[PDB]
Amino acid sequence: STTYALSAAQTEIWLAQQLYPDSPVYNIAQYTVIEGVIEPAVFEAALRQVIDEADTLRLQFIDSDDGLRQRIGTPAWSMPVLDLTAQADPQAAAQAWMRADYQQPVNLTQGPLFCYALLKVAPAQWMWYQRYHHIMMDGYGAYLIAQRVAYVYSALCEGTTPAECDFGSILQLLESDAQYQISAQRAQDEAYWLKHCANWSEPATLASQRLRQTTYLAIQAPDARRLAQFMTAAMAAYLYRFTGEQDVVLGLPVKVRFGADRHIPGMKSNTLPLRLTMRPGMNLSSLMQQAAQEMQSGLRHQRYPSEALRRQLGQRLFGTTVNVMPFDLDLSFGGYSATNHNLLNGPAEDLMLGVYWTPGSHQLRIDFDANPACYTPEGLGAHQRRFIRFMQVLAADATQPIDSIDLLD
């Protein structure tokens, strides 16, 4: 078989896992509540076919005298079917089983990298459990795999045999990344990103089990990327008004493009550094203009990975990360409606700002995913109350210079 090198993020995950082998933070857990009946055998066959379709679930990461590598394997896996029909609290026992799963650490050399289970906690209420490792999957690919399984199960139970996948093999990404490693374009992106972050500083940050506090709201006064740039400028202006930093840097995850016409599950996002300078008298329109300017003069070197940049330098480049994305559309599991609920995301990038919207809807959802060693349940809640009203004063007057705004408690 042919092996492939590990990406910088994958190598960091591997070494951080081997240093703390009792750490379950690199487990992404998810469960799907299906309000209806489920055929476990057809479900297992759909899991079959999608596992072989999204071949990132077939990767095995191994050690050798030549270094960390990865290849396509035939991983040995199971699908347990637990029936919690006869318990006083079936949901509690189901949550206990799932929590007992994703709380254990996962050895990466030889071991189950994903966990698929089926929980029946009511006569017509199933729960499909999904666990992965951060070295092989993110959240978006997990949702893609969830819908592919939903569609193929829907097909197989009604006699239909499903259409071909709209997925790309992970080998595409592996080979093009191997060729990008020896690329002149990679050396140019390196030179650019280290000229750009040369006389940089620390990151402006509100830093002092993973914390979360959600807040729903509605703004009156676009598309989606204007929403992204407005939220980026607002978070940067809030950081500057709270910390007094003219130079603040935010983390912006971008979906790298290199010629893949299909979504490759497991191919993650490169979070780029966006340094905004907040000169005096500046307003929101000026800050959004500078943000667009700086991302435009950086989206051509987007392929250069963040971890390689942070290693070619001298503990992080940014403390706050802005992730603007709508909610995922729901799935149908053989005619039955199913809604996903995530138990465990990934580790903390100090602070992750999540903005979730609905098409045609004015209501937003703000998420604060913070590191507990840097925030408190009270400090994070005060920042989200402070940041949101600041953002609302910004949305009502782009004419307003950031300095003349004074926010509360």
Residue numbers in the entry: 7 to 214, 222 to 234, 240 to 332, 337 to 431
Source paper text:
Nonribosomal peptide synthetases (NRPSs) are multimodular enzymes that catalyze the biosynthesis of diverse peptides with a wide variety of activities. The incorporation of an acyl into peptidyl backbone is usually implemented by a starter condensation (Cs) domain, normally located at the beginning of the initial NRPS module, via the formation of an amide bond to the α-amino group of the first amino acid residue, a process also known as lipoinitiation. Genome mining of two Cs domain-embedded cryptic NRPS biosynthetic gene clusters, rzmA and holA, in the bacterium P. rhizoxinica HKI 454 resulted in the discovery of two distinct types of lipopeptides, cyclic rhizomide A (1) containing an uncommon acetyl chain (C2) and linear holrhizin A (2) harboring a medium octanoyl (C8) chain. Similar to other C domain structures reported previously, RzmA-Cs adopts a “V-shaped” configuration and consists of two subdomains (N- and C-lobes) each representing the chloramphenicol acetyltransferase (CAT) fold.
We found that compared with wild-type (WT) RzmA, mutations at R148 indeed altered the production profile of rhizomide in vivo. A similar trend, but in the reverse direction could be seen for the HolA A149 mutations, in which longer residue side chains led to shorter acyl chains. These synchronized changes showed that the length of the side-chain of this key amino acid (R148 in RzmA-Cs, A149 in HolA-Cs) might control the length of acyl chains. The side-chain may act as an entry gate to a potential pocket. Therefore, truncating the side-chain of this residue could give a correspondingly deeper space for the extension of longer acyl-CoAs. After our initial attempts to cocrystallize WT RzmA-Cs with acyl-CoAs of various lengths failed, we noticed that the R148A mutant protein showed strong binding to C8-CoA, as evidenced by the high ΔTm in protein thermal shift assays and a Kd value of ~300 nM measured using isothermal titration calorimetry (ITC). Thus we selected this mutant for crystallization, and successfully obtained both unbound and C8-CoA-bound structures. The unbound R148A structure is mostly identical to that of WT RzmA-Cs in two conformations.
